[PDB]
């Protein structure tokens, strides 16, 4: 076929004196191969990368031309872009310590194109490969924070909270020193989402409520944070902290816009909640909050059961097990277990 | 082998990958807050207590612990404050 | 006071740091003891301690110590003479790390002996020391190492990860040293150089002697700008040198600064000859003595009445409790250190404001 | 320069040694001993590199090594030959254990009497560690205990960080056997810390003993939180151990018993956990019982039996023991 590029590249390789026309002819070849009949451009670029990777070229113009080719790469359909990115990542692998700058940008571009295709697994693995601690280059704090938040978000969208928490713990180290307020807000949002995904509902609710008071955040995002805080507080376990949080949220004036104001007003006054006034609530619950507790009961109708039990403690002096299960939907048995669990922790 | 080196002596320095690990007493990340400062809404100092050994904790966490036992919670060594950072 | 100069005397006795070849017998060690007595009489021991630590780091990281038992006993002698415990602990950690590094290097040489790397397995030595005691800075600077050493760092990193997984190794290129071979016409003389000097010398190696400019050298070595100039000072202004290896400077000037766009070039026929007569098998060391690596009085008055406040609040307290309460109170002010609190502790006990319990060494009593 | 002189001399020495022909070499090295010593400070580098080149023939050439070390002892009496000589002790002795080399090794008795009745902390620690290893090989607990109490006095030494971690491990085992867990926990933590930096085989073995000591400490604080022990959390050898730690704290019964039953061939093998497992499976049950009967005023014994997965008689015995 039309594989004549390799011979002329090899012939130019053994040149005696340093020159710049090689970059110009590379640009000419690439631009004339952009509009090509088939995949000959991909083969030409692969041969170019293979010939360029070899150490025989001095590392004073190799880096500049490599990053120029990397920056010119995205102006190309992603089908060949993914393949060429994988090829160059594999070819740079044997010697990485020299080209520690282009690898980062290449992996960032690969992760971006993977994310644009709704693929939250491979992009995280690609972004992980960037050496941010064990590397000879010194990256700025903002770059590391942004990469960590990106990886945490990608892991969260893949329903893997453990990895998201592990990679947000590192970002928490650099949060306190970075001066970018937008980065701090993004880190706070990511941490709140991670806490929500770990079934720690009261802490996530408190964090969301605190974030809702930030003036920098735009109004719609503030309302979204308030709604998430309300949902987390409602889903939280009964106790004094939850009661205080409910009172604080009820004191807020802007809480009437949310569609769950009736449930908040009923739960604030220690009123028993039945299943009739909850069916529309479970419709708007996020799917990660609808998971069961491996006991046949979802998260919602365990917090609501604990709240009913706590509220019944104010309007009764002594109650039998059968009557306690009659108004709590427990047949006879687990009502006693729930009551005993709610005690020995100071809740009731 | 012209214009080339012959013998090389490399020197490298190792350090722990994760510096600030979770506080053992409270189990929540050390450089965020304690349990009560966030609830009472003064959780802006809440500063860590890196000790002589290398173990980090919360000041609020360790304040209750030191009263009973005056040794490091993990390695049971003498507890003296080496450097406090925030 | 003399301070650092006195430390220089120690550098002339405990090891052959540079011009310290004048060693006679073990009796000089006794003289060193007298120097220790001076350290007891004189004040401002922080500078002396820092100079001693720097000298020990320079001697150990280069393996130029005249004696080993004397160096080991120096820690005990300094502890007996009286010094901060942090310095003694750091010295002990450094000695332990140096001891472990020999075994690590032996294991690396014995295990990796089939891949052949680039150089022989008996010519590469690896010394991994803990960064919490043997170093204080944490800034990384690129050096653009040559292709020969580009295949040795990854192998060392892989071996360290396999043996001691859980720790990250950050290579320090400033403290590394090596020996290179030159071919400057009349005589091939070995030269001892660091990493930056090696990179600077090897930059002009891909095209004979030729001639290169300052901008080209900076773009090739990719050094940290001004620091690169300092490296040039090592290769253009070598003290007591008849003829430098890189005998160039273009517009004369001085190696300190004002390099501008000087065209430095290596001298192919440079007269680098030992004793100025036939450099058949000479050797030149170019590293030299490099060893590259709220006012106080108004601020110290803050904490003493804080300690006295903690004491007047409660009479009975332990050391750990006192530290916890002190650091609990002083968070709004500056973050306390360890040395300041200790200094205040014996300043308080020496003024007899508090009583040290006899049964318990840590329990304190108010007055 | 005589340094390169005897460097070339030992070079030929080894060139001829590859062609065996020993008596000439030995006698040449013997007559060059004093000249090399006086001319240049020999100490470690050259003699130790010769020993490195020579230990590759540890099989056979035993008589040659023995006579080499004899002449090094009786000729290099000047200066300190001891520090590498305990290395010869570890090489020859503890290879056949109870051989009379153990009885002979006590020729350091003059230094022993000079120190005890100091400032030679390193040598004392090394010899104490060697004797501890030998007496552990022979399983003499009283001698190990006496050695540990005698070694506890030294607090002004700078040892290699493997010698210290052996006597610390011995002290931890002694404390565990005697019954003092408080010191056993810290002793095993110190032993693991010293093994981590230098060592290999007995590295993921002191961690397991440390975990067991912490679990015999009435719970409190997960050992897998310090920076030294976290990297080995996912190690296959220690996965059962960290699962046991996670089960013990946050009291539960089914997970603990399931972990104990599944890893029968990985936990219940050594004679150290197979004996102390009876103290466990009883502290966790006691904690569960205390946590369960808190909000009750009149409870049924069979209910406790169902909760604790034991029969009525064991529940009654446990209740009687707890009340008494
Ligand atoms: Zn804490
Ligand atoms: Zn706090
Ligand atoms: Zn500690």
Which among D113, D55, D117, D115 is positioned nearest to D84, based on CA atoms? D55
Which among A136, A74, A145, A141 is positioned nearest to A111, based on CA atoms? A74
Chain C residue numbers with beta carbons less than 8 Å from the beta carbon of B13 are 128-131, 134-135, 169-172
A18: left (phi over 0), alpha (psi -120 to 50) or beta: beta
Alpha carbon distance A154, A120 (integer Å):
5
Tokens of A204: 């996530």
SS3 B46: coil
Q: What is the least distance, in Å, from the CA of B37 to any CA of chain C?
A: 14
Tell me the structure's resolution in angstroms, rounded to a single decimal. Answer: 3.5
Q: CB–CB of C31/C10 below 8 Å?
A: no
User: Determination method here?
Assistant: cryo-EM
Which among A54, A83, A60, A64 is positioned nearest to A26, based on CA atoms? A64
Tokens of C175: 């403290």
Q: What is the SS3 assignment for chain A?
A: CCCCHHHHHHHHHCCCCCCCHHHHHHHHHHHHHHCCCCCHHHHHHHHHHHHHHCCCCCCCCHHHHHHHHHHHCCCCCHHHHHHHHHHHHHHHCCCCCCCCCHHHHHHHHHHHHHHCCCCCCHHHHHHHCCCCCCCCCCCCHHHHHHHHHHHHHHHHHCCCHHHHHHHHHHHHHHHCCCCCHHHHHHHHHHHHHHHHHCCCHHHHHHHHHHHCCCCCCCHHHHHHHHHHHHHHHHHCCCCHHHHHHHHHHHHCHHHHHCCCHHHHHHHHCCCCCCCCCCHHHHHHCCHHHCCECCCCCECHHHHHHHHHHHHHCCCCCCCCHHHHHHCCCCCCCHHHHHHHHHCCCCCC
Alpha carbon distance B70, B77 (integer Å):
9
CA torsion sign, C352 to C353 to C358 to C360? Answer: negative
State the maximum Cα–Cα separation within chain A, in Å, rounded to a whole number: 99
Which among D179, D235, D180 is positioned nearest to D207, based on CA atoms? D235
Helix (H) or strand (E) holding C204: none
SS3 C191: strand
By the CB < 8 Å criterion, does A169 face chain B? yes
Q: How many helices (H) and strands (E) does chain C have?
A: 13, 8
Alpha carbon distance D200, C238 (integer Å):
46
Inter-chain residue contact C140 with A58, CB threshold 8 Å:
no
Neighbour-count burial for D227-238, b at 16+ CB within 10 Å, e otherwise:
bbbbbbbeeeeb
Neighbours of ion ligand 3 (CB under 5 A): B 53, 55, 72, 75, 77
Helix (H) or strand (E) holding C316: strand C316-317
Residue C129 dihedral angles phi and psi, to the nearest 5°: -120, 150
Burial class (CB in 10 A: 0-12, 13-18, 19+), C265: middle
Residue keyed to tokens 């006879």: A332
Q: What angle do CA A267, A269, A271 make, to 5 degrees?
A: 65
**Of the partner residues C139, C154, C169, the one whose CB lies closest to the CB of residue A97:** C154
Q: Are strands C124-130 and C167-171 parallel, antiparallel or unpaired?
A: unpaired
Alpha carbon distance C252, C262 (integer Å):
9
User: DSSP string covering C206-245, please?
Assistant: SSSS----HHHHHHHH---THHHHHHHHHHH--TT-SS-S
Alpha carbon distance D104, D92 (integer Å):
11
Neighbour-count burial for D182-201, b at 16+ CB within 10 Å, e otherwise:
ebbbbbbbbbbbbbbbbbee
Q: Which residues of B are annotated as a binding site for Zn(2+)?
A: 23, 26, 34, 37, 46, 53, 55, 58, 60-61, 72, 75
Residue D100 dihedral angles phi and psi, to the nearest 5°: -60, -10
Tokens of A282: 């479970």
SS3 C193: strand
Q: Are strands C354-356 and C167-171 parallel, antiparallel or unpaired?
A: unpaired
Alpha carbon distance B29, A207 (integer Å):
15
CA torsion sign, A204 to A206 to A208 to A210? Answer: negative
SS3 B81: strand
Quote the DSSP letter at residue C353. S
Alpha carbon distance C314, D274 (integer Å):
49
Alpha carbon distance C71, C68 (integer Å):
5
Q: CB–CB of A111/A150 below 8 Å?
A: yes
Alpha carbon distance C202, C199 (integer Å):
5
Tokens of A52: 């360029």
Distances (CA, A) of D1 to A306, C66, C190, C278, D259: 90, 17, 19, 19, 69
Looking at all shown ligands, the one closest to residue B35's CA atom is 2
C273: left (phi over 0), alpha (psi -120 to 50) or beta: beta
Alpha carbon distance A327, D97 (integer Å):
76
By the CB < 8 Å criterion, does A60 face chain C? yes
Rg (CA), chain C: 26
Q: CB–CB of A124/A151 below 8 Å?
A: yes
CA of B55 to the centre of ligand 3 (A): 5
Helix (H) or strand (E) holding C163: helix C153-163
Alpha carbon distance C303, C339 (integer Å):
13
What are D37's strand-pairing partners?
A: none
Helix axes C85-111, C45-60, angle to 10 degrees: 10
Alpha carbon distance C271, C249 (integer Å):
16
Q: Which residues of B are annotated as a binding site?
A: 23, 26, 34, 37, 46, 53, 55, 58, 60-61, 72, 75
Helix (H) or strand (E) holding C341: helix C338-350
Which among C176, C246, C190 is positioned nearest to C214, based on CA atoms? C246
Q: In what order do the strands lie in the sheet with C354-356?
A: C316-317, C364-366, C354-356
Q: CB–CB of D197/D161 below 8 Å?
A: yes
What are C283's strand-pairing partners?
A: C190
Inter-chain residue contact A134 with C169, CB threshold 8 Å:
yes
Residue C191 dihedral angles phi and psi, to the nearest 5°: -130, 130
Chain A residue numbers with beta carbons less than 8 Å from the beta carbon of D295 are 339-340, 343-344
Looking at all shown ligands, the one closest to residue B77's CA atom is 3
Which among A119, A70, A117 is positioned nearest to A92, based on CA atoms? A70
Number of neighbouring beta carbons within 10 Å of residue D248:
21
Tokens of A313: 């403690």
Alpha carbon distance A207, A224 (integer Å):
13
Centroid of chain to Cα C345: 32
What are C308's strand-pairing partners?
A: none
Looking at all shown ligands, the one closest to residue B49's CA atom is 1
Q: CB–CB of C204/C214 below 8 Å?
A: no
Which among C69, C57, C189, C61 is positioned nearest to C125, based on CA atoms? C61
Distances (CA, A) of B82 to A174, B20, C86: 22, 15, 10
Quote the DSSP letter at residue C187. B
SS3 C351: coil
Which among C60, C63, C47 is positioned nearest to C8, based on CA atoms? C47
Distances (CA, A) of D180 to D32, D65, D168, D217: 56, 45, 15, 10
Neighbour-count burial for A125-134, b at 16+ CB within 10 Å, e otherwise:
ebbbebbeee
Burial class (CB in 10 A: 0-12, 13-18, 19+), A182: exposed
**Of the partner residues C128, C180, C341, the one whose CB lies closest to the CB of residue B12:** C128
Number of neighbouring beta carbons within 10 Å of residue D53:
13
* Cβ neighbours of residue A11 closer than 8 Å, sequence gap 6 or more: none
Alpha carbon distance D112, D126 (integer Å):
12
By the CB < 8 Å criterion, does D80 face chain C? yes
Q: What is the SS3 assignment for chain D?
A: CHHHHHHHHHHHHHHHHCCCCHHHHHHHHHHHHHHHHHHCCCCCHHHHHHHHHHHHHCCCCHHHHHHHHHHHHHHCCCCCCHHHHHHHHHHHCCCCCCCCHHHHHHHHHHHHHHHHCCCCHHHHHHHHHHHHHHHHHCCCHHHHHHHHHHHCCCCCCCCCCCHHHHHHHHHHHHHHHHCCHHHHHHHHHHHHHHHHHCCCCCCCCHHHHHHHHHHCCCCCCCCCCCCCCHHHHHCCCCHHHHHHHHHHCCCCCHHHHHHHHHCCCCCCCCCCHHHHCCCCCCHHHHHHHHHHCCCCCCCCHHHHHHHHCCCHHHHHHHHHHHHC
Q: What is the least distance, in Å, from the CA of D292 to any CA of chain A?
A: 8
Alpha carbon distance D24, D13 (integer Å):
9
What are C365's strand-pairing partners?
A: C316, C355
CA atoms within 13 A of residue C5's CA, in its CB half-sphere: 3
Q: What angle do CA C33, D43, C135 make, to 5 degrees?
A: 65
DSSP helix, strand, coil percent of chain B (3-state; round to 5) = 20, 25, 60
Q: CB–CB of A183/A202 below 8 Å?
A: no
Centroid of chain to Cα A212: 20
State the maximum Cα–Cα separation within chain B, in Å, rounded to a whole number: 71
CA of A33 to the centre of ligand 1 (A): 61
Tokens of C345: 């502790």
């Amino acid at each position: 076929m039309a594989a004549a590029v390799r011979q002329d590249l090899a012939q130019l390789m053994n040149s005696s004196g340093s020159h710049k026309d090689l970059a110009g002819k590379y640009r000419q070849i690439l631009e004339k191969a952009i509009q090509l009949s088939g995949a000959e451009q991909l083969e030409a670029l692969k041969a170019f990368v293979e010939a360029m990777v070899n150490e025989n070229v001095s590392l004073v113009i190799s880096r500049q031309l490599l990053t120029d080719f990397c920056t010119h790469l995205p102006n190309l359909p992603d089908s060949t872009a993914k393949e060429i990115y994988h090829f160059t990542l594999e070819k740079i692998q044997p010697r990485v310590i020299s080209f520690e700058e282009q690898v980062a940008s290449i992996r960032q571009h690969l992760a971006s194109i993977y994310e644009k295709e709704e693929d939250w697994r491979n992009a995280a693995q690609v972004l992980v490969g960037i050496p941010l601690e064990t590397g000879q280059k010194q990256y700025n704090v903002d770059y590391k924070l942004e990469t960590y938040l990106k990886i945490a978000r990608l892991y969260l969208e893949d329903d893997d909270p453990v990895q998201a928490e592990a990679y947000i713990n590192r970002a928490s180290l650099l949060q306190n020193e970075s001066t970018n307020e937008q980065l701090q807000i993004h880190y706070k949002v990511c941490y709140a989402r991670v806490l929500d995904y770990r079934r720690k509902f009261i802490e996530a609710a408190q964090r969301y409520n605190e974030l809702s008071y930030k003036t920098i955040v735009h109004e719609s995002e503030r309302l979204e944070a308030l709604k998430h805080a309300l949902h987390c507080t409602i889903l939280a376990s009964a106790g004094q902290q939850r009661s205080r949080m409910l009172a604080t949220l009820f004191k807020d004036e802007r809480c009437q816009q949310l569609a769950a104001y009736g449930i908040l007003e009923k739960m604030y006054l220690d009123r028993i909640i039945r299943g009739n006034q909850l069916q529309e609530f479970a419709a708007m619950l996020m799917p990660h909050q609808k998971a069961t507790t491996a006991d046949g009961s979802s998260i919602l109708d365990r917090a609501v059961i604990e709240h009913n039990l706590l509220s019944a403690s104010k309007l009764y002096n002594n109650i039998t097990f059968e009557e306690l299960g009659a108004l709590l939907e427990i047949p006879a048995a687990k009502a006693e277990k729930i009551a005993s669990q709610m005690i020995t922790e100071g809740r009731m | 082998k012209m214009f080339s080196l012959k013998k090389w002596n490399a020197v490298a320095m190792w350090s722990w990958d994760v510096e600030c690990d979770t506080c053992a007493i409270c189990r929540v990340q050390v450089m965020d807050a304690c349990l009560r400062c966030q609830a009472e809404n003064k959780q802006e100092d809440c500063v860590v207590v890196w000790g002589e050994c290398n173990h980090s904790f919360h000041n609020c966490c360790m304040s209750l612990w030191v009263k009973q036992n005056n040794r490091c919670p993990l390695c049971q060594q003498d507890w003296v404050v080496q450097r406090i950072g925030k | 006071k003399c301070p650092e100069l006195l430390a220089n005397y120690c550098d002339m006795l405990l090891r052959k740091t540079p011009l310290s070849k004048k060693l006679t017998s073990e009796e000089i060690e006794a003289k060193l003891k007298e120097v220790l007595l001076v350290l007891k009489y004189v004040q401002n021991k922080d500078v002396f301690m820092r100079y001693h630590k720097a000298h020990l780091t320079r001697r150990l990281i280069l393996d130029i110590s005249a004696d080993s038992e004397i160096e080991e006993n120096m820690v005990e002698w300094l502890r007996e003479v009286g010094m901060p415990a942090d310095y003694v602990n750091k010295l002990a950690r450094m000695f332990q790390d140096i001891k472990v590094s020999e075994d690590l290097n032996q294991a690396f040489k014995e295990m990796h002996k089939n891949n052949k790397l680039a150089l022989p397995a008996d010519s590469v030595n690896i010394k991994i020391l803990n960064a919490g005691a043997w170093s204080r800075s944490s800034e990384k600077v690129f050096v653009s190492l040559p292709t020969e050493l580009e295949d040795l760092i990854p192998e060392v990193e892989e071996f360290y990860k396999k043996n001691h997984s859980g720790r990250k190794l950050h290579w320090h290129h400033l403290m590394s040293n090596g020996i290179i071979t030159f071919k400057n016409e009349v005589g091939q003389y070995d030269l001892e150089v660091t990493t930056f000097q090696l990179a600077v010398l090897f930059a002009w190696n891909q095209r004979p002697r030729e001639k290169i400019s300052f901008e080209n050298l900076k773009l090739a070595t990719e050094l940290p700008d001004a620091e690169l100039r300092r490296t040039l000072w090592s290769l253009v202004a070598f003290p007591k040198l008849k003829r430098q290896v890189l005998l160039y400077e273009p517009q004369v000037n001085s190696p300190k600064d004002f390099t501008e766009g000087t065209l430095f070039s290596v001298n192919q026929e440079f007269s680098l000859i030992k004793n100025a007569k036939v450099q058949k098998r000479g050797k030149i060391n170019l590293i030299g003595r490099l060893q590259l690596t709220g006012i106080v009085q108004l601020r110290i008055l803050r904490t003493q009445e804080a300690i006295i406040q903690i004491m007047k609040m409660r009479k009975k307290i332990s050391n750990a409790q006192l530290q916890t309460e002190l650091v609990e109170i002083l968070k709004n002010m500056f973050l306390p250190q360890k040395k300041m609190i200790k200094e205040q502790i014996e300043w308080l006990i020496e003024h007899k404001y508090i009583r040290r319990d006899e049964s318990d060494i840590n329990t304190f009593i108010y007055m | 320069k005589g340094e390169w002189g005897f460097k070339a001399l030992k070079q030929m020495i080894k060139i001829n040694f590859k062609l065996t022909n020993f008596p000439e070499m030995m006698n040449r090295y013997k007559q060059l001993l004093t000249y090399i010593r006086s001319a240049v400070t020999r100490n470690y580098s050259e003699k130790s590199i010769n020993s490195i080149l020579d230990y590759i023939s540890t099989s056979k050439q035993m008589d040659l090594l023995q006579e080499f070390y004899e002449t090094t002892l009786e000729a290099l009496k000047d200066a300190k030959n001891d520090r590498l000589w305990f290395k010869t002790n570890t090489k020859l002795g503890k290879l056949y254990l109870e051989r009379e080399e153990y009885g002979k090794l006590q020729k350091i008795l003059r230094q022993l009497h000079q120190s005890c009745q100091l400032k030679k902390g390193t040598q004392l620690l090394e010899i104490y560690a060697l004797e501890i290893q030998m007496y552990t090989a022979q399983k003499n607990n009283k001698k190990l205990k006496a050695l540990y109490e005698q070694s506890l006095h030294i607090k002004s030494a700078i040892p290699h960080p493997l010698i210290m971690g052996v006597i610390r491990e011995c002290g931890g085992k002694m404390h565990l056997r005697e019954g003092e867990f408080e010191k056993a926990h810290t002793d095993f933590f110190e032993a693991f810390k010293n093994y981590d930096e230098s060592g290999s085989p007995r590295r993921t073995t002191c961690l397991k003993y440390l975990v067991l000591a912490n679990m015999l400490m009435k719970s409190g604080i997960n050992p897998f939180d310090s920076q030294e022990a976290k990297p080995y959390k996912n190690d296959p050898e220690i996965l059962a151990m960290t699962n046991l730690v996670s089960a013990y704290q946050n009291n539960d019964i089914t997970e603990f018993e399931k972990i104990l039953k599944t890893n029968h061939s990985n936990i219940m093998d050594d004679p150290f956990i197979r004996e102390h497992i009876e103290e466990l499976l009883r502290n966790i049950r006691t904690q569960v019982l205390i946590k369960l009967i808190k909000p009750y005023t009149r409870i049924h014994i069979p209910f406790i039996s169902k909760e604790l997965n034991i029969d009525v008689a064991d529940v009654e015995s446990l209740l009687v023991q707890c009340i008494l």
